[PDB]
Amino acid sequence: MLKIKLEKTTFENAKAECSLVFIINKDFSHAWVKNKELLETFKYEGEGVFLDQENKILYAGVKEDDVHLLRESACLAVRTLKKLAFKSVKVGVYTNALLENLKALFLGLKLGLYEYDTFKSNKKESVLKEAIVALELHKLEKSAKEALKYAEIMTESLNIVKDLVNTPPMIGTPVYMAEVAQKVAKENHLEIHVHDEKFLEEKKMNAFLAVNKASLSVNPPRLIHLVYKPKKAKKKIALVGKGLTYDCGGLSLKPADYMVTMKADKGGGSAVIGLLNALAKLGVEAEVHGIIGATENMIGPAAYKPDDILISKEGKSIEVRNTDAEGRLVLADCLSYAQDLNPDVIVDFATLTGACVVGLGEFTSAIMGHNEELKNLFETSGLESGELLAKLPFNRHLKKLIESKIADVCNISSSRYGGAITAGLFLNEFIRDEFKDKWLHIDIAGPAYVEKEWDVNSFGASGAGVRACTAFVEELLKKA
Amino acid sequence: MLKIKLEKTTFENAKAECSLVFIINKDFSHAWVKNKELLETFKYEGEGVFLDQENKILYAGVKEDDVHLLRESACLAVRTLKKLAFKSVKVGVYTALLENLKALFLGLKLGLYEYDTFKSNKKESVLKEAIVALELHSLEKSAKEALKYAEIMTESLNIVKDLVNTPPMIGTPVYMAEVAQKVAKENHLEIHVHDEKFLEEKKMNAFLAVNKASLSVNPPRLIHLVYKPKKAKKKIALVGKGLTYDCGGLSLKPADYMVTMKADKGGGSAVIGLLNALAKLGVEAEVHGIIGATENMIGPAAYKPDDILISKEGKSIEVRNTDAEGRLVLADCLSYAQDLNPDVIVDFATLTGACVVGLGEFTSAIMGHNEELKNLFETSGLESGELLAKLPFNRHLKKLIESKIADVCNISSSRYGGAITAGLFLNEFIRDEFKDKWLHIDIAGPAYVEKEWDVNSFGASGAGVRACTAFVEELLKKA
Amino acid sequence: MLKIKLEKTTFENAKAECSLVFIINKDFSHAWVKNKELLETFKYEGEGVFLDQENKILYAGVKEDDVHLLRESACLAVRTLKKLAFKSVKVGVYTCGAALLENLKALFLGLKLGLYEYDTFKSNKKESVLKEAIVALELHKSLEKSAKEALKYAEIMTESLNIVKDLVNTPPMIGTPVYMAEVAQKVAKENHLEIHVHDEKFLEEKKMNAFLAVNKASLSVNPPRLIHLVYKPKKAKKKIALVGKGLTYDCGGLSLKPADYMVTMKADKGGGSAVIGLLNALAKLGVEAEVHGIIGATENMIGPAAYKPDDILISKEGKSIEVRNTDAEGRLVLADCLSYAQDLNPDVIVDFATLTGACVVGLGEFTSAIMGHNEELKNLFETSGLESGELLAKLPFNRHLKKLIESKIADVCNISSSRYGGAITAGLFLNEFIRDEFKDKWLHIDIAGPAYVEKEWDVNSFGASGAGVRACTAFVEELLKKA
Ligand code: NA
Ligand code: NA
Ligand code: NA
Ligand SMILES: [Zn+2]
Ligand SMILES: [Zn+2]
Ligand SMILES: [Zn+2]
Ligand SMILES: [Zn+2]
Ligand SMILES: [Zn+2]
Ligand SMILES: [Zn+2]
């Protein structure tokens, strides 16, 4: 809740309790650097932050003239000030290019306040409450206002997602996800449907139901369906999300080291809820459907099993060989329900595979699908939004590794290599021909939840997928 | 090899002891399908091969009208006929025309390859020739061009494959050098073969560290091939990991992961084959092939987790795992490569398991800074029939190879991003003035695979050779 | 080194390019807190350091009035100042809960230790501008004589510690057993000590086959060294033998260590290294005792000549040893070196070894284990050692543990038959090689935890700590007091 006040005034004349000045690429020459000697004395060379005490100026380093590094720096700056006693900070303006840099600056600043400290007995309300932005170029009023609108909506949407994903699993049940979705629907006047295991049975979503069987009597599943219907709809978009509120691996039980952080296996479903908040408040011209399959994957005497053969809603049978490959079962059924809506575009988000993380690192999501133009659009837009992405290619050799001797498809690969992609090729088996060129699969298993601070993300949930998909939709609608 | 004869005749008039007919996308309607009824009776629907016994016609299915699937079926067809009694097969011409003809002739030829040297039941094939009727399903010009590529590329691939398949007691660093010597003699190439004393003079201590355990058994070799044509539009350095065996070192591999490590020399072998291909194709570029050859063995002299190595470039390396040895060898070989002032540097290595986990066994990773250069390699490589993907660097991953007691650590602090942090390790040894001239290709996946797939027999594939050849040809076009 | 200058003046009139003031227990009331308002505005509440830029004052928090936290904070202050542009810092004299002498020692040693870091191989490494601390002889709450005594201790102990740390931090390709002998030779030359460096033939003649078995794998690459340093003062009240495990690298042998466990094994020479540093310290402190430093140096490598599970070795002492795991090699080298040590007929024998993983599992990374039979001797080492700033714990033998190192085909086994009590059963194994006439004169110190830690803690930088040197030094001094 960092308020940003835009003011038609010079940086020098603007009034706040302290000052923020960015040092881009180690350039200390600007007028705003009031006491350069002080920096020399204490050897500040532009890496990280430095507080001039006398002048009450916080300097924040930006290693290269780069919009993404500016976003990071702004976040680090406000993180720093949050611990101090200044109620307000003033900052000059740093910079299509102008709009993107103002978005980065304002979003950066606002995300600086976030941390998941709900359970800390020492949590303190920040004194820092406002950033005063002097509308004057470091090197317009229309752009600032637009950027500020984005920053407020995106900050709110990301923090919704981050709060949901960070919520511990005894609390963050499938029912709890549905409640978060209800608030978002009520806030934006959206249509929402919340289906239970009875609906799932009716629609023959037996893959989804299988995953939930261990825990049905404790925490029943929810299929959550949000709809944003605007005045003008240029496209119909289905966003499909894995809402595994806890994943212990089922009977194929995860080792202890790997079960921690599995409250974040609802990262994909949570991003979809945040995406409907963001896309509705931005008022995009598209009918957007947010579909979340929510359940735990627990172990117990009613668990689904290695050797079970499940009949998916689409009709294809699935040999289960490992119950820890559960996200793709839930997704198989949720994608089927999505396709019944006849959307122009389907994007699914999932913390699907460990192999993705092994391949791309913790900070980068994978993009899969058939339509290269579509995959490129999502990548380019996503990269610009500040998310790290990489396309991973299908091939015919990988496709063969998910065959089953006794079912239509196996829920794991016969090889220990290519897991993220064979997982995407599993999902493909349930994408109808007439949707294969309209479909994107985004595996956010890495950056959805990371146990350290990085970029604009505090320890834990990051809200991965939200910015990227928002940018993707906006660019898509520009062509439409 | 498979002799391919180009004849200006109709398919019908051409003569051979059997016929090969491709069935594209289940189209059985063509005149060359002599007896449709037979195929109906025996339920042949165009998947794989089917042999018309009376007419002596082998049908080979191509699932889609696709040049790469054609290359695959052509290989399967010859594999099938290799076990039969026909000395010759005739085939029509299938169709851009150039790539199709290249795919056809290459695929046909590769169908004969099997690593069967140590098999006691091996017989010589009866099949010697494919008669190609120059008739579509000038032409002769394109055909003669595709056949020249096919012959050079088959030869080049089989050089790489025989070398990679050679078991480690035989395929020593010295053995690699001898193979490189042969290629240089056949191609009138300049060649230098340096030993551990040269390494020592050049202060290539990361390289030497990996070899220390086994120095007294099989000494290391730095192999330097040079192709220098009449006209050189570019200077190109090709740099290969030549680990002729990798047991992991003191960080010993589990038994399950040590099998196939004779193929840790896949990158170095690719480079040897590339100089064969690029010299015989007569490309207008000066090409240097640089191969760092050694084993990574375990013993009382092995370099150790906790060793801190001074690279030739001068940066220090904290060793935390002796099974990340390839990047040490390459660190020094890249430094040697850069002294040559090349316009382009590409390295090939079977570098990381994480690459394989990430992309699957059939696909190589492309890393670097220059997007235009990576894109050229990717696009040309895919067209050559190799599977590739670009993997992106980022600033977060770069932090993971930091060391508290050296300039860089030879492993990442994270379990995640292995192939890429290995790429970022290599990057610390690429001078600023070469960072935009550099490609890193991780072929740990497709270099060696324990089954047949596409045009590849069990074992070595020759991965990297086709993709880099196409990359070079495309590159010189723009120069 | 950080030059310390003692000056007879007030803190205020002393001159330096910056000041250091400790803030104890969040009390900001002292006159040396020049601008108290500044600290409030920027929410400095006494945790860690805070720099008053305008006044050039570094505050360093000391959570309680405690001599050990003072030592830690001093170190932090100088670590912080090392990265700045000040050539000199001035500080006053602090007397926390120790006494004046121990507080002076803490302050001066902490300050000096703040400069250490193992950065030899770093390319970015730069010399620090910070060269001196000006100590103004004025109490925060004979002073000069005590300060001179504390300064000498801090000077000798800093030097001794950094010798151990440089040696332990040295990577294994370089830090061979021969390299260990060379460092010992330098120490000997510097201090005019007797030194003997025995090779594998001496080991052979003395029938030290446990020692030799460990070395067999790597004999042809790096021959072993038995290092024997001797400090002989005019007046010696006691003969003290210090015995150290000098495994310059331990890959585990044929019982190969997992990869994640083989890293840091350059530090398996921590015990031997501490003994080398201990002779430097004790000679320069001029202690009144004949001190022997015995170091068994070798690698424990894998190879075709490596000693094996099922090998049965005849120790120098005569007892046969069933080997069931080659990664329990330190106790074999120590069996033979302890035997050698007892041949000196010392009054006290202390061995130091990075001996067991179980010790670390038991006490944590920061604490050493003390074993032996003589409770009073054990207590002297513990108390002395704690006061010196090392963390320590006595671990008790018992008869049930002793049975677990029995062998069906030899006199003793080099591992226990149980997964439990590893550090203690290793100590009981050592005991089998301690003659009856030395059982009440023997201490075994397992420094497997603190000798090497992969982070900064207390006064120790990433890596080697020099664990054991401060503790043993204090123990010898206390011992000689009563003698
Ligand atoms: Na994650
Ligand atoms: Na492979
Ligand atoms: Na330790
Ligand atoms: Zn799972
Ligand atoms: Zn899951
Ligand atoms: Zn390796
Ligand atoms: Zn390797
Ligand atoms: Zn050991
Ligand atoms: Zn040891």
Method of determination?
X-ray
Of B279, B287, B284, the C-alpha closest to B231 is B284
> Catalytic: A254?
yes
DSSP code, position A124: -
Closest-approaching ligand to the CA atom of C299: 9
Collapsing DSSP to helix, strand or coil, B281 comes out as: helix
Cα of first residue to Cα of last residue in chain A, in angstroms, is 35
Cite the DSSP H helix spans in B325-370: 326-338, 353-359
Give me the CATH topology for the region C1-142.
Leucine Aminopeptidase, subunit E; domain 1 (3.40.220)
Maximum Cα interatomic distance, chain C, rounded to a whole number of Å: 76
Contact of A131 with A91, CB cutoff 8 Å: yes
Residue B312's Cβ-side half-sphere holds a number of Cα atoms within 13 Å equal to 24
Q: Which strand ranges, in their side-by-side order, compose the sheet holding A388-391?
A: A191-195, A222-228, A287-297, A236-247, A345-350, A439-443, A364-369, A388-391
Which CATH number applies to C142-483: 3.40.630.10, 3.30.1360.200, 3.40.50.620, 3.40.190.10?
Answer: 3.40.630.10
How far apart CA A245 and CA A252 sit, in angstroms, is 17
Interface test with B, best of A395, A399, A415, A444 (most B CBs within 10 A): A395
Do B52 and B35 meet the contact criterion of CB atoms below 8 Å apart? yes
**Where do we find the tokens 């009824």?**
B37
CA C10 to chain centre: 36
Residue ranges, CATH 3.40.630.10, chain A: 140-480
C386 by DSSP, 3-state: which? helix
Residue B347 CB burial class (10 angstroms; 0-12, 13-18, ≥19): buried
Residues 6+ apart with CB under 8 A from C382: C370, C392, C393, C394
Domain B1-138 in this protein, CATH class: alpha beta
Which listed residue (C331, C378, C441, C470) is catalytic? C331
Q: How far is C78 from chain B (nearest CA, A)?
A: 19
Which residues have CB under 8 Å from C189's CB, separation 6+? none
End-to-end CA distance of chain C: 34
Q: Using a CB-CB distance cutoff of 8 angstroms, which residues of chain B are in contact with residue A356? A: 358
What is d(CA B61, CA B27) in angstroms, rounded to the nearest whole number?
A: 10
- Evaluate whether C134 touches C12 at the Cβ level (below 8 Å): no
What is the C-alpha separation between A70 and A76, in angstroms, rounded?
Answer: 10
Task: Give me the torsion for CA of A371, A376, A377, A383, rounded to 10°.
Answer: 150
Report CB contact under 8 Å: C302, B306: no
Residue ranges of chain C that CATH labels 3.40.630.10: 142-483
Show the CA angle centred on residue C440, arms to residues C438 and C441, nearest 5°: 60
Chain region(s) in chain A for CATH 3.40.220.10: 1-139
> Alpha-carbon distance B391 to A392, whole Å?
9
How far is it, in rounded angstroms, from Cα C91 to Cα C79? 15
- C210 with C413: CB under 8 angstroms? no
Distance C268 CA to ligand 9 centre (A): 5
Decide: C229 and C279 in contact? Cβ < 8 Å: yes
Resolution (A): 2.0
Neighbours of A263 (CB within 10 A): 24
In chain B, the N- to C-terminal Cα span, in Å, equals 35
* CATH code of the domain occupying A140-480: 3.40.630.10
Q: Tell me the catalytic residues of B.
A: 253, 327
Helix (H, G, I), strand (E, B) or coil at A144: helix
Whether domain A1-139 has CATH 1.10.10.10: no
Q: Which residues pair with A5 in a beta bridge?
A: A132
H or E element in which residue B89 lies:
strand B88-93
Question: Is the separation of the CB atoms in A443 and A388 below 8 Å?
Answer: no
Q: Are B86 and B128 in contact (CB under 8 A)?
A: no
**Residue environment code for C90-111, b if the CB has 16+ CB neighbours within 10 A, otherwise e:** bbbbbbbebebebbbbbbbbbb
Please tell me whether residue B408 adopts helix, strand or coil conformation. Answer: strand
Chains that touch A (3 or more CB pairs under 8 A): B, C
C384 near C471, Cβ under 8 Å? Answer: yes
Planar angle of CA B310, B316, B322, nearest 5 degrees? 80
In sequence order, what are the residues at sequence separation of 6 or more whose Cβ sits closer than 8 angstroms to the Cβ of residue B167?
B262
Position C134: which residue type?
Answer: I
Residue range(s) of every CATH 3.40.630.10 domain in chain B: 138-479
Do C122 and B323 lie within an 8 Å CB cutoff?
no
Chain C nearest-CA distance from A85, in A, is 7
Å from A86 to nearest chain C CA? 9
Q: How far apart are CA B78 and CA B459, in angstroms?
A: 18
Residues spanned by CATH 3.40.220.10 within chain B? 1-138
- Rounded Cα distance between C360 and C386, Å, is 18
Separation between Cα atoms, residue C29 and residue C32, nearest integer Å: 9
Strand, helix or coil for residue B3: strand
- Cα A253 to middle of ligand 4, angstroms: 9
Question: What residue of C is the nearest CA neighbor of A41?
Answer: C85
Q: Where in chain C is the domain with CATH 3.40.220.10?
A: 1-142
Amino acid sitting at position C34: K
Angle between helices A372-385 and A466-479 (to 10 degrees): 120
CA–CA gap between residue C401 and residue C198 (Å, rounded): 35
> Which tokens belong to B442?
């991780």
Whether the Cβ atoms of residue C301 and residue C249 lie closer than 8 Å to each other: yes
Task: Please indicate whether, in this complex, the C-beta atoms of C266 and B314 are within 8 angstroms of each other.
Answer: no
**CATH class belonging to B138-479:** alpha beta
Write the CA distances from A235 to A188, A238, A271, A272, A289, integer angstroms: 19, 10, 20, 17, 11
Contacts of B82 (CB under 8 A, 6+ apart): B111, B112, B125, B127
Distance B358 CA to ligand 5 centre (A): 18
Cβ–Cβ of B416/A454 closer than 8 Å? no
Q: B325: annotated binding-site residue?
A: yes
Residues A390 and B419 sit within 8 Å (Cβ to Cβ): no
Which residue, chain included where needed, has tokens 């709009």? Answer: A99
For the stretch C184-192, contacts whose Cβ atoms lie closer than 8 Å and that sit 24 or more positions apart, written own/partner, are: C184/C227, C184/C229, C184/C276, C184/C293, C184/C295, C187/C163, C187/C229, C187/C276, C187/C277, C187/C279, C187/C280, C188/C229, C190/C280, C191/C231, C191/C279, C191/C280, C191/C283, C191/C284
Rounded to whole angstroms, the Cα distance separating C264 from A334 reads 50
Distance CA C198, CA C208 (A): 12
Cβ-based burial of C15 (10 A; exposed 0-12, middle 13-18, buried ≥19): exposed
Q: Cα–Cα distances in Å, from A412 out to A416, A423, B172, C406?
A: 10, 7, 39, 50
**Which value, in Å, is the radius of gyration of the alpha carbons in chain C?**
23
- The shares of helix, strand and coil residues in chain B, as percent rounded to the nearest 5, are 40, 25, 40
| Paired tokens of B249 | 């070192």
- Up-side HSE of residue C147: CA atoms within 13 Å toward CB? 18
3-state secondary structure of A397: helix
Give one DSSP letter per residue of A48-98, joined into a string: SEEEETTTTEEEEEESSS-HHHHHHHHHHHHHHHTTSS-SEEEEEE---HH
Q: What distance in Å separates the CA atoms of residue B291 and residue B222, rounded to the nearest whole number? A: 6
| CA geometry: angle A33, A39, A45, nearest 5 deg | 100
Answer yes or no: is A455 a known binding residue.
no
